[PDB]
Amino acid sequence: ASDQRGYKPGGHVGTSVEYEDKVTRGFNNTDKKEKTITNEVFNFFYNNPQWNFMGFYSFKIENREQKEPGYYENEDGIKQLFSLNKGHDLGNGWATGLIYELEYTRSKVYSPDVSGLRKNLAEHSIRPYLTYWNNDYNMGFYSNLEYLLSKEDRNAWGKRQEQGYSALFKPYKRFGNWEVGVEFYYQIKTNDEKQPDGTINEKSDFNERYIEPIVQYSFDDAGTLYTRVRVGKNETKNTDRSGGGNAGINYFKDIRKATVGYEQSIGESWVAKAEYEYANEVEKKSRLSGWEARNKSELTQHTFYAQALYRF
């Protein structure tokens, strides 16, 4: 699923901006710095609860700058999202539906080694979902499955395919102005990356899990305040057929994220939303290759997000 932060599982028009500041203290005990600015120039949402069907389109301009000892990378791209959602009531507080979501990105990378390499990436997500809500106990849940297919052409650098499934279970309750929930997530995925050659860069098996409590207070005559904390792990196990000396090497990650946000209507039509996210990820290898200063790679990330939309 897209990592857009504008919505969570008649219409609106919106715009947003996202800034991501990222420092990785890597296996060489040095710092790789990345700054990404995402400009969502326009999004559009269509709600037709008469067909019980939703549509969503988004247009983003992305600029990423990467710097580290002896290397830089600049990428400028355009990212479009198209998402459909046909729901279906089952009665008695049950409901199902099917979300299709296509995220398509065209970018160009500049670095000491390439002077404008064109990348094209297509991410397909299909998610059947099942929701339930109980009025007496003010409790219920969201749950979905996902087939995920990701195709990337990187020309001189070769191609990459990721194919995968995930499950998501999110029970939640309401009391007063409070809503508390815990999101449970699991993902499995295979990765295939080759050079134009057919030469293999990566052949690996991936899995990820996390738990994400979310707390939400809704003010009576103001907006909504919320916080989500994620604790997760994932593993990337290379097969013996991998490239880059990763053959047989396993990567293990611990993930911690904390997010604070505030959403508030302005007048009867506008809605503004601001959100901050601190993330920390620690990676280790099952086998060094010999060059590393240490067996630890540590990501620290700050993200700021602001959105305004106009409902109608």
Retrieve residue 102's tokens.
């296509």
Cβ partners under 8 Å of residue 106, min gap 6: 77, 78, 118, 119, 120, 121
Cα→Cα distances 285→69, 147, 188, 194, 289, Å: 22, 28, 19, 22, 10
Contact, 121 vs 127, CB < 8 A?
A: no
Beta carbons within 10 angstroms of residue 193's beta carbon: 21
Question: What residue ranges in the chain does DSSP mark as E strands?
Answer: 11-25, 31-48, 53-68, 71-91, 94-110, 115-134, 139-153, 159-175, 178-194, 200-218, 224-238, 250-266, 270-285, 297-311
Left (φ > 0), alpha (ψ -120 to 50) or beta: where does 198 sit? left
Nearest Cα neighbor of 83 from 141, 131, 129, 43 is 43
Provide the domain limits for residue 299: 1-312
Whole-number CA gyration radius for the chain: 21
In the three-class reduction of DSSP (H, G, I as helix; E, B as strand; rest coil), residue 224 is classed as: strand
User: Where do we find the tokens 């990592």?
Assistant: 3
Tell me how far apart the alpha carbons of residues 190 and 206 are, in angstroms, rounded to a whole number.
6
What is the number of domains present in the chain? 1
Closest CA to 217 of 177, 182, 180: 177
Tokens of 70: 């002896």
> From which experimental method does this structure derive?
X-ray
Contact 97, 89 (CB under 8 A): no
* Residue 307 exposed, middle or buried by CB count within 10 Å (0-12, 13-18, 19+): buried
* Residues written for the chain: 312
Q: Resolution, in Å, please?
A: 2.3
Q: How many other CB atoms sit within 10 Å of the CB of residue 220?
A: 5
Pairing, β 115-134 against β 139-153: antiparallel
Residue type, 175: F
